[PDB]
Amino acid sequence: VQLVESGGGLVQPGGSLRLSCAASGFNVYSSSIHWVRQAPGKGLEWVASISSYSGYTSYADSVKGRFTISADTSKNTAYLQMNSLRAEDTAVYYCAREYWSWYSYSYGIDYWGQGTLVTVSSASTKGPSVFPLAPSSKSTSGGTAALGCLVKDYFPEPVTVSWNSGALTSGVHTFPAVLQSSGLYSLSSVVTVPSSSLGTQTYICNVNHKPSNTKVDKKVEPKSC
Amino acid sequence: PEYIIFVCAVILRCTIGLGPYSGKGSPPLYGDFEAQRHWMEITQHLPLSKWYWYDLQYWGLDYPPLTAFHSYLLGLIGSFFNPSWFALEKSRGFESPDNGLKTYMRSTVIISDILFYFPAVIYFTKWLGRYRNQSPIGQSIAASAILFQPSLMLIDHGHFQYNSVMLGLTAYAINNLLDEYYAMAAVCFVLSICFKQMALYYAPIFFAYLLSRSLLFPKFNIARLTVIAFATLATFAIIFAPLYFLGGGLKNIHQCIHRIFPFARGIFEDKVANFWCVTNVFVKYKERFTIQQLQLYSLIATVIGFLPAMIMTLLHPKKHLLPYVLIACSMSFFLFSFQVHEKTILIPLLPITLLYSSTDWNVLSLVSWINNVALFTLWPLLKKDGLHLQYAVSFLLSNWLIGNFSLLPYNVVWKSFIIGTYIAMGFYHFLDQFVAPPSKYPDLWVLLNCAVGFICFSIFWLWSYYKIFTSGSKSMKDL
Amino acid sequence: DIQMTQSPSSLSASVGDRVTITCRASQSVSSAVAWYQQKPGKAPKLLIYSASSLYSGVPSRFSGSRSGTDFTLTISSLQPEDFATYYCQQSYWVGYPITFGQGTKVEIKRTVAAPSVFIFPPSDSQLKSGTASVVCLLNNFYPREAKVQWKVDNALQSGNSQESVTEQDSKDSTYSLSSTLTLSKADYEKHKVYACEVTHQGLSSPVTKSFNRG
Ligand SMILES: CC(C)=CCC/C(C)=C/CC/C(C)=C\CC/C(C)=C\CC[C@H](C)CCOP(=O)(O)O[C@@H]1O[C@H](CO)[C@@H](O)[C@H](O)[C@H]1O
């Protein structure tokens, strides 16, 4: 009663993949598998389907030919082969069941796969570059003192950052990474303090990328003017 | 003494069985001939638990088992004659220059006809004549008119379907009904279903008829009830067991069932002399309602149609009433169902043609009229299937040899109507052969056909209900 | 061919309120439309199918309906644990492609707030990297609708700026925002004064924040 996905990772454009979805305790010849993909930060979008009784594949008007769905009830498995993989096809992918009945009486999409990530890109795994969001030298003393640190030119996802290595976890913000045109990413850690307290407390942010296995730390301070 | 028909009929059939197989020169996905060849191919190379799963996008098996078994037998024999014809995944689109394998398939169709269609109708006419003590010449004519029914002869030979088998099986069912061998009649029926699910149209009759006769009509008899329950269930079990046991089991039973009755698709995509194909062009159902509303309205329509006939059957089961009520129910089904194609009309044409044996003149006139009409409403299929000529060949032949040169009922109303429709048919045959459609919507003539057939069939079915209600006068039954 | 227009783009309503989402069909040839809920991160969960049947396992404050071609969903007693994105989804029949809505995000309604603005120039560390990247921040405002414009040496730049927001906070439930702007090292050095101008509903008078180089 719970689908599972398998097969997902970086693939250069022109590449190919074959995502697999395995069922659990329900026949897959009576469910009309769909493959619903969601682009990052966008709405859901259906891709391909099946009828499970008459092999009626129907591919969305963007994936004519480049993809090909398939099924196998011998082992309750469903496959989606991918052949072109243009740069924008990066997304999350779910397999989804939908149980029709007599008189075309739908029953909705009961069971959803947990979801796999797919990243279509052409670039080498790169480590991050940090620059401190130094607090304004002429900041208003006592009150608002907002500072942070920027990470830029890192690939792929994800990256984690903290302040004073967990010793500063109040009023903090982590802006989602935006895939800049050059192809890398970037983001930032921000927090504010009393400006009087700023002249007292030490502040060091702490960044770590699991894919590159790289830990960096950095003290932030107002540039001397 | 009279067997001359028994041979000239076969000569006629084989002479027609020279035309084009359906879908001749159809590169990507051929016609029906290819479907039959392909089922015979894949039935003799895969385990029993893989006949329904193999290739469900290329003519995957579609009929109940008996079609599978019969095609398996014929495939065995054809392989014996030559295995190179049935090359698995290779002879997919066999097209021999020397016309190999074509004469073979035609011989198969002919033999199936001879075995399961001829003797049934022949013995049935024998029975009726015997009971009514008529001239043997009369009975010979009453059989030779039937066997030359043009529509069926054309659709079996050339277009290549085995409708004959299921037809004759239901004929045997009717016979066994006449001679009260009910326990065998039920079995002939259940056999006829399992060859083509399309013959479910008569179930609303046989259900009520057997029910009344055995259970209720003479007395509240009980024995025969368990008899027939024994027999029918036995038939179903012995015909489905090779699937469940020797195959994947209940999985394969469920796949078979849902592969016999596939879910509905599209709305009114085929032009047939149905009820919706006609009124769709005015009211444009596509926008008025959803799909489930139409699948419910069609069901209610068919039930409302064949209900009165079922009630009257349960009320007055009499041997001299069957052809009428069978026509009532078959026509109720073919007139209002949701997805009907260009054929199926043959399935009402069984209890229509079974009427030639009657003594009245109006009935014979009407029956010949409607057979001509039915032959007509199949013209588009033929035209887009070749058969430029055989259409008119058999059209002529059947009308000639039934005595149409000396003809019409004894009533100007019916006469005016029949002649008008005949003009219409003649008329239409021009508007396509030389005239082009207005190009504002080209496929019009076909819709003109979808139309002109509907009026005919509707009035016919109404006259069938008429003949039911007006009769039941406890007439001599020798009619 | 086939699609659905989900309206409106975005609502806000606090607890207890009752609200309604509409979904204008394209051709009403089928009545199988489902309404799904998605929390961030997870996979959507079925709520309503066959256009009126409540799913088994969902509180009954939800109620669907069909109006000819204008399907409709209603929530009566909006609880705080019901804020997610809701999707209309139509499927015609078996072998026919299906299509989803465009997305509807409920969120909390509250008082306006003011976006605290700040700005940061590139640092010498980045001045070794090869490019400059100025940034300016907005914080703790409401409503979420706001905008900023870069203005460098008295101009109005465009195309080379990127903006980002986070999700509404849990405790105080407001938004922040960053807008960065990338230039080549010599490009940034070509100009002297830099600014970004904030406009926002909660902002009575659109403010500017600027600095000369150094
Ligand atoms: C006492 C007894 C025997 C009771 C029997 C009760 C039975 C047999 C009930 C059967 C009804 C059932 C189990 C389900 C109803 C079927 C359904 C919900 C939808 C059916 C959809 C299709 C369209 C109807 C069945 O399909 P079918 O009966 O096989 O009709 C063929 O539809 C083709 C369409 O193009 C034609 O081309 C072809 O000519 C024609 O034969």
Q: Which domain holds residue B97?
A: 4-470
Same domain, C92 and C179: no
**Cβ B374 vs Cβ B349: under 8 Å:** yes
Residue C80 placed within a domain? yes
Residues of chain B found within 8 Å of residue C93, distances taken between Cβ atoms: 263-266, 291
B77, two tokens: 């024999």
Same domain, C43 and C96: yes
Domains of chain A: 4-120 (2.60.40.10), 129-219 (2.60.40.10)
Q: Does the beta carbon of B284 lie under 8 angstroms from any beta carbon of chain C?
A: no
Q: Which of A46, A129, A223 sits opposite C99 (nearest CB)?
A: A46
Q: How many domains does chain C have?
A: 2
Quote the distance between the C-alpha of residue B437 and its chain's center. 32
Q: Which of C54, C86, C105 is the last residue of a domain?
A: C105
CA-nearest residue of chain C to A57? Answer: C95
Instruction: Enumerate residues 6+ apart whose C-beta is below 8 A from B94.
Output: B37, B85, B101
- The CA-based angle B443-B449-B451, given to 5 degrees, is 105
Query: Whole-angstrom Cα distance, residue A8 to residue A90?
Result: 11
CATH number at residue C72: 2.60.40.10
B325, two tokens: 């009520």
- Which residue numbers come right before each break in chain C (C to N over 2.5 Å)? none
Q: Which of C31, C95, C96 sits opposite B292 (nearest CB)?
A: C31
Same domain, C23 and C91: yes
Same domain, C70 and C132: no
Could C93 and B265 be called an inter-chain contact, meaning their C-beta atoms sit closer than 8 Å?
A: yes
How do strand C19-24 and strand C70-75 relate by DSSP bridges?
antiparallel
A58, A95, A151, B60, C144 from A69: Cα distances, Å: 9, 11, 40, 19, 41
Same domain, C20 and C92: yes
Residue C111 placed within a domain? no
Query: Whole-angstrom Cα distance, residue A99 to residue A52?
Result: 10
Q: Which helix (H) or strand (E) holds B70?
A: helix B65-81
**Cβ B32 vs Cβ B159: under 8 Å:** yes
Same domain, C122 and C150: yes
Same domain, C67 and C141: no
Residues of chain C found within 8 Å of residue A152, distances taken between Cβ atoms: 133
Q: Can you list the positions of beta strands (E) in C101-212?
A: 104-105, 116-120, 131-141, 146-152, 161-165, 175-184, 193-200, 207-212
Q: Which helix (H) or strand (E) holds B237?
A: helix B223-244
Q: Which of C43, C46, C123 sits opposite A115 (nearest CB)?
A: C43
Collapse the DSSP code of B190 into the 3-class scheme (helix H, G, I; strand E, B; otherwise coil) and give the result. helix
Closest CA to B153 of B20, B10, B4, B355: B10
For a substitution probing ligand 1, which of B228, B339, B342, B349 has the most ligand atoms within 8 Å of its CB?
B339
Closest CA to C31 of C92, C106, C99, C114: C92
Same domain, C18 and C73: yes
For B143, left (φ over 0), alpha (ψ -120 to 50), or beta? alpha
**Cβ C82 vs Cβ C35: under 8 Å:** no
CA-nearest residue of chain A to C37? Answer: A44
Same domain, C75 and C129: no
Chains that touch B (3 or more CB pairs under 8 A): A, C
**Cβ A172 vs Cβ C171: under 8 Å:** no
Residue B476 placed within a domain? no
A21, A28, A148, C125 from A164: Cα distances, Å: 42, 51, 11, 21
For residue B295, which atom of ligand 1 is closest to its CA? Answer: 19
List the strands of the sheet with C62-65, edge to edge. C5-7, C19-24, C70-75, C62-65
**Cβ C110 vs Cβ C166: under 8 Å:** no
Instruction: Enumerate residues 6+ apart whose C-beta is below 8 A from C62.
Output: C35, C47, C48, C54, C73, C74, C75, C76
φ, ψ (nearest 5 deg) of residue C106? -70, 155
* b/e A79-108 (16+ beta carbons within 10 angstroms → b): bbebeebeeebbbbbbbbbbbbeebbbbbb
Could C32 and A104 be called an inter-chain contact, meaning their C-beta atoms sit closer than 8 Å?
A: yes
Same domain, C9 and C101: yes
Distance B295 CA to ligand 1 centre (A): 12
Q: Does the beta carbon of B264 lie under 8 angstroms from any beta carbon of chain C?
A: yes
Residues of chain A found within 8 Å of residue B337, distances taken between Cβ atoms: none
Could A51 and C94 be called an inter-chain contact, meaning their C-beta atoms sit closer than 8 Å?
A: yes
Q: Which of A43, A150, A180 sits opposite C162 (nearest CB)?
A: A180
* Identity at B207, one-letter amino acid code: F
**Cβ A195 vs Cβ A139: under 8 Å:** yes
Residue B478 placed within a domain? no
Residue C29 placed within a domain? yes
Q: Which helix (H) or strand (E) holds B373?
A: helix B361-377
Q: Does the beta carbon of B263 lie under 8 angstroms from any beta carbon of chain C?
A: yes
Query: Whole-angstrom Cα distance, residue C101 to residue B468?
Result: 56
Instruction: Enumerate residues 6+ apart whose C-beta is below 8 A from B216.
Output: B314
Q: How far is C29 from chain B (nearest CA, A)?
A: 4
CA-nearest residue of chain C to A136? Answer: C120
* b/e A46-63 (16+ beta carbons within 10 angstroms → b): bbbbbbbbbbbebbbeeb
Closest CA to A123 of A43, A49, A180, A59: A180
Resolution of the experimental model, in Å, one decimal: 3.9
Q: Does the beta carbon of B295 lie under 8 angstroms from any beta carbon of chain A?
A: yes
Q: How far is C204 from chain A (nearest CA, A)?
A: 21
Collapse the DSSP code of B175 into the 3-class scheme (helix H, G, I; strand E, B; otherwise coil) and give the result. helix
Q: B212: burial class by Cβ within 10 Å (0-12, 13-18, 19+)?
A: middle
**Cβ A107 vs Cβ C50: under 8 Å:** yes
Residue C166 placed within a domain? yes
Q: How many domains does chain B have?
A: 1
φ, ψ (nearest 5 deg) of residue A10? -60, 135
Residue C180 placed within a domain? yes
For a substitution probing ligand 1, which of B198, B239, B292 has the most ligand atoms within 8 Å of its CB?
B198
Could A104 and B254 be called an inter-chain contact, meaning their C-beta atoms sit closer than 8 Å?
A: no
How do strand C175-184 and strand C131-141 relate by DSSP bridges?
antiparallel
Could C45 and A112 be called an inter-chain contact, meaning their C-beta atoms sit closer than 8 Å?
A: yes
Q: Which domain holds residue C142?
A: 116-212
Residue B66 placed within a domain? yes
Residues within a 6 A CB radius of ligand 1? A 102-103; B 197-198, 200, 203, 207, 261, 264, 338-341, 343-344
A70, B341, B373, B477 from B349: Cα distances, Å: 43, 15, 11, 22
Q: What is the DSSP letter of C55?
A: P
Query: Whole-angstrom Cα distance, residue A199 to residue B470?
Result: 110
Q: How far is A114 from chain B (nearest CA, A)?
A: 27
Q: Which of B56, B254, B263 sits opposite A55 (nearest CB)?
A: B56
Three-state SS sequence of chain A: CCCEEECCCCECCCCCEEEEEECCCCCCCCCCCEEEEECCCCCEEEEEECCCCCCCCCCCCCCCCCEEEEEECCCCEEEEEECCCCHHHCEEEEEECCCCCHHHCCCCCCCECCCEEECECCCCCECCEEEEECCCCCCCCCCEEEEEEEEECCECCCEEEEECCCCCCCCEEEECCCCCCCCCCEEEEEEEEEHHHHCCCCCEEEEEECCCCEEEEEECCCCCC
Closest CA to B258 of A103, A104, A53: A53
Same domain, C122 and C200: yes
Length of chain C: 214
Q: Which helix (H) or strand (E) holds B274?
A: none
Q: How far is B292 from chain A (nearest CA, A)?
A: 6
**Cβ A44 vs Cβ A24: under 8 Å:** no
Closest CA to C103 of C37, C55, C165, C195: C37
Residue B477 placed within a domain? no
C211, two tokens: 């600095």
Distance B455 CA to ligand 1 centre (A): 25
